[PDB]
């Protein structure tokens, strides 16, 4: 409603010698979390028990905005987040003054958004061919999972519901989310990426003929990044640990057949 007279501008990135093969080349949006523009508003005036419906409607709007990886209106990024920093952590503060309906259930959706952002960053980072071919193939797999399972169903269905269905509820939102079961596959991929990061961190911190007649000698060589054999062993260990869930095991079979 108001105006801040802030120069909202978007520009292409000048430096390109250390942006990965699939990283974006545009500057970040003008940091609403710190740069105010046209509004600095809260729902305490409509925090009355009766205006809870309008409050939760605006909350629904904001949670629809935040799930795409871009922060909403009444949500502020935590200061550790730096757009130009590609290794900065993902965290943000939400106003606890509103009804617990705003903060309790939204933790799952904001964790989904955080893991979506970190998975996009992992896709951009794993574009480096020095990480082996299996990792950049898993990158294409996670891109397909994001742009053909997450975006095609979730955001489109949610927008259609918020535009047509009268008074859509966050309960029905969570219901259709768990009915699409994208959260389980997303958590599996997140755990896979966590194990990959663990192996990379270990390899980075740890820097220090008799019978069969074969003219072969051992060359025990370890690289700073895992390779195809390590990734296959990791996937086998994961499927062995997650034996029992039919959807999980069939998804893992498809992923192993594809990579």
């Amino acid at each position: 409603m108001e105006i801040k007279e802030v120069d909202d501008r978007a520009e292409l990135l000048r430096y390109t010698n250390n942006i990965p093969l699939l990283g974006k080349l545009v500057n970040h949006q003008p940091l609403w979390s710190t740069n105010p523009k046209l509004k600095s508003f809260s729902l305490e005036k409509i925090s009355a028990p009766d205006q809870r419906r309008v409050q939760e409607a605006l909350v629904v709007k904001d949670l629809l905005n935040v799930l795409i990886g871009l922060e909403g209106t009444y949500i502020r990024y935590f200061n550790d987040y730096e757009p130009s920093d590609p290794e900065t952590p993902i965290e943000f503060k939400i106003a606890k003054k509103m009804d617990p309906s705003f903060k309790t259930f939204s933790r799952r959706i904001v964790r989904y958004g955080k893991q979506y952002m970190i998975l996009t960053r992992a896709y951009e980072k794993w574009s480096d061919t020095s990480f082996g071919m299996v990792l950049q193939r898993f990158a294409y797999e996670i891109r397909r999972f994001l742009e053909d399972v997450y975006l095609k169903t979730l955001v489109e269905r949610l927008e259609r519901d918020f535009n047509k269905v009268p008074n859509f509820s966050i309960r029905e939102l969570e219901q259709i989310i768990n009915e699409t079961e994208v959260n389980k596959q997303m958590e599996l991929l997140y755990n896979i990426y966590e194990e990959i990061f663990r192996e990379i961190e270990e390899r980075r911190t740890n820097q220090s003929s008799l019978h069969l007649r074969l003219m072969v000698a051992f060359d025990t060589t370890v690289y700073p990044v895992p390779k195809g054999g390590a990734i296959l062993k990791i996937f086998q260990q994961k499927i062995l640990e997650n034996l029992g869930d039919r959807s999980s095991v069939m998804f893992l079979k498809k992923l192993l057949n594809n990579i």
Binding site: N18, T34, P36, D85, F218
Partner: protein, 62 residues
């Protein structure tokens, strides 16, 4: 013939391998511009709360 070694080599592909490390200082300068912007926004928010607090006192006195 039985031996154990250790590797000190890795693959590098010129099309996407890093050419120089000064881009980290370049993005540091970008973050410095970001910090200046954040300070300016803090100033503007202080101005806004001052004006709106004055409006609050005026309406409470009226």
């Amino acid at each position: 013939k039985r031996h154990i070694t250790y590797a000190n080599s890795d693959i590098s592909n010129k099309e996407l391998y890093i050419n120089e490390i000064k881009s980290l200082k370049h993005e540091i300068k970008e973050l410095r511009k970001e910090k200046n912007d954040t300070l300016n926004n803090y100033d503007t928010l202080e101005e806004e709360t001052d004006d709106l607090k004055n409006r609050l006192q005026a309406l409470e006195k009226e």
